[PDB]
C-alpha cells in the first residue's frame, strides 16, 4: 500500500514534461503529413504519431 | 599397481575427461536457435551476448560450429569484447585440459594476430578457464607466462 502511494508520486514525475502546443488542422495530406496552424504563429507541416 | 590406481581414482581427472566425453558424444544443441538470435543484431551487446551464449551451449563440447560459420560477424566485435570472445572459446574447449592447451596453441596470439593485444590477453584468460578448478604444472606455466606477460593488457585476463 505504501509502495502504491509513493509510486503515484513517481508517476507525478510526468508533470515535469513540457506541454505540447495546441493547434487547429487546416487540412491533411498523405504520408503522415498534416498542415496545422499554430495558435499564435503560422502554418506548420507536422509528422503524425503512430497512435 | 593398486597405489597408482588409488592416486588416479582420488584425482578424478579421468572422470572430468569422461564428463567431456559425455558432452562431446551427446549434445542437444540447435544451430537454428543460434542463427535466429544471430539474424537480429544491435551490432553492440548482441555480438558479445551471442558469443557468450554459444560458449555456454558448447561448453566442454569443443563444438565451435557457430564460430566456424561466421568469420565477418566474429570480426565485427571490438578489441575488448573480442578479448571476452577468446575467453568464451576457452569455455567451449573446457574439457580436454592438457589436450585443450595443445588445441589453444592453434588459437595462440603468434598463431593468430600479434597486433591484437586484447586477443592475447583473452587467450591467457581462456587458458585459465580450461584448467580452472585443477592444480597443475600448467597453472605454474601460466604463472611463468604471467611473469613474462605485459603488466596491464595481458594481465587484464592473464
Amino acid at each position: 500500500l505504501n509502495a502504491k502511494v509513493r509510486l503515484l508520486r513517481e508517476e507525478l514525475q510526468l508533470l515535469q514534461e513540457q506541454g505540447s502546443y495546441v493547434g487547429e488542422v487546416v487540412r491533411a495530406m498523405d504520408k503522415k503529413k498534416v498542415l496545422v496552424k499554430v495558435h499564435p504563429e503560422g502554418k506548420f507541416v507536422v509528422d503524425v504519431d503512430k497512435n | 599397481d593398486q597405489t597408482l590406481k588409488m592416486i588416479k581414482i582420488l584425482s578424478g581427472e579421468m572422470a572430468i575427461e569422461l564428463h567431456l566425453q559425455f558432452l562431446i558424444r551427446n549434445n542437444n544443441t540447435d544451430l537454428m536457435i543460434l542463427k535466429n538470435t544471430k539474424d537480429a543484431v544491435r551490432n553492440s551487446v548482441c555480438h558479445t551476448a551471442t558469443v557468450i551464449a554459444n560458449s555456454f551451449m558448447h561448453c566442454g563440447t569443443t563444438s565451435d560450429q557457430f564460430l566456424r560459420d561466421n568469420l565477418e560477424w566474429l570480426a565485427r566485435a571490438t578489441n575488448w569484447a573480442k578479448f571476452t570472445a577468446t575467453a568464451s572459446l576457452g569455455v567451449i574447449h573446457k574439457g580436454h585440459e592438457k589436450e585443450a592447451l595443445q588445441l589453444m596453441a592453434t588459437y595462440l596470439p603468434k598463431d593468430t594476430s600479434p597486433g591484437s593485444a586484447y586477443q592475447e590477453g583473452g587467450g591467457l584468460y581462456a587458458l585459465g578457464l580450461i584448467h580452472a578448478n585443477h592444480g597443475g604444472d600448467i597453472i605454474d606455466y601460466l604463472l611463468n607466462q604471467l611473469k613474462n606477460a605485459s603488466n596491464d593488457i595481458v594481465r587484464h585476463g592473464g
Partner: protein
C-alpha cells in the same frame, strides 16, 4: 426491411473513402526536410 441493404451501402461507401518511398531518393529528401516545416 430493404433499409438494411441501403444502410450497408452507405457504411460501405464510407469505408471505401477511408480505404482510398523510394529506397534511397525519398529517404534522402526525408532527411533533408525538417520534422517540422513552416510554409512562408
Amino acid at each position: 426491411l430493404e433499409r438494411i441493404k441501403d444502410y450497408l451501402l452507405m457504411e460501405e461507401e464510407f469505408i471505401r473513402n477511408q480505404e482510398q518511398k523510394q529506397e534511397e531518393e525519398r529517404s534522402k529528401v526525408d532527411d533533408l526536410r525538417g520534422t517540422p516545416m513552416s510554409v512562408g
